[model samples]
Target: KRTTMRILIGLLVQNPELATLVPPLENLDENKLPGLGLFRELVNTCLSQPGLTTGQLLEHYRGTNNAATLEKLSMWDDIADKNIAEQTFTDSLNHMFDSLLELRQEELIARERTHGLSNEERLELWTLNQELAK
Candidate 1:
């Protein structure tokens, strides 16, 4: 879980806007898991953004931008393989966002069941559900 979290954080740092889709970290400890549906919506939005391909991703980490970081990771030979690196990076991004969404959704449901959502929350959730249906 620690490694996974680290990997996810690393990816999220590059694409900070997606952070908005993630539930708070504390929500994870509370077993909130439904927010993932919302995350899927957010991720779909991200896919439409420019330059998410593996090659483009590599560009972000290569050269001087990630030299020190790469050096640390390069202790492991597998990280040097472009295919493996790209796949690992891609998979991590998806997994992290999905986990965050699940956590956030679960929190939202819990809140609604307990205190109920504000009008804004209700509207947003409705919108999200509608999008999901499509």
Candidate 2:
């Protein structure tokens, strides 16, 4: 079965924690066999290394899977351009985190408009920004 961009996007969007297990088969559409296989392989690679960067994980797969394997599995949709896959993964995660952080910041701003941010709240936001950096 052919893999679709939706499957990749769905997994990353729905479950950003690569440290956890891959999404259940049904959640990823069981009929998309190729996509599911590729995803499981990717998840396995991530699991093999506890804290690998996106770049590192993709590199390990590309270095091991080779061209024929990549073609057979249809790993070329989102990862068609191997050079940019890492950045894409990084961007996807950052996009989700950034949106959440922005929303929280706006909520704080709104609360401040109503009652103002206390020192504790300001410090909390500072700590969050620091965490975002790393």
Candidate 3:
């Protein structure tokens, strides 16, 4: 989650033009995920003002609860070379979706194997695979 999220935020913070690449999130499970709260707000902020730069991005979170994560992300964004960010920028976002789906799938499967899934979760697992396939 650390590495995956940093790349996505780095692009939006560094380049900002890539804000359109991110669609609004769907069916997000916030409980188990790390970095998700910051990520969601970051995307919303960037999408609203796509021209924001790294420092501008940091500006939005000045005194918010997300400040710490943004500061760390800012430092990493500074230290990491742009070349790596260029390569992983889109791939990182793509992988982020796949990771979320896979995480949910595995969790559901584990419940099915160990404990059990309710009727609702059984249907959910089926749809999760359907979504993952695409």
Q: Tell me the whole-model lDDT of each prediction, alpha carbons only.
A: 0.51, 0.57, 0.75
Local accuracy of candidate 3 as per-residue lDDT tens digits, 1-134: 67677766665667666767877675687566776766677778788786777778777767778677767777666644565766689767766788778899999999999999999999999998887776
**CA deviation > 4 Å runs, candidate 2:** 1-6, 9-32, 63-65, 68-134
Which candidate ranks first by lDDT, i.e. highest? 3
Q: 4-55 in candidate 1: lDDT tens per residue? A: 4344434443454555566544333324443333334334444555435433
TM-score of 1: 0.28
How does residue 118 of candidate 2 score in lDDT? 93
Error of 1 at 3 (Å): 32
What local lDDT score does residue 86 receive in model 3, on the 0 to 100 scale?
68
- lDDT (Cα, tens digit) per residue for candidate 2, span 8-72: 63343233354365555435654655456556666666566666654455455375547565444
- The per-residue C-alpha lDDT of model 1 at residue 7 equals 43
Model 1: residues with Cα > 4 Å off, grouped in runs: 1-81, 123-134
TM-score of 2: 0.34
Distance (Å) between predicted and true CA of 9, model 2? 7.0
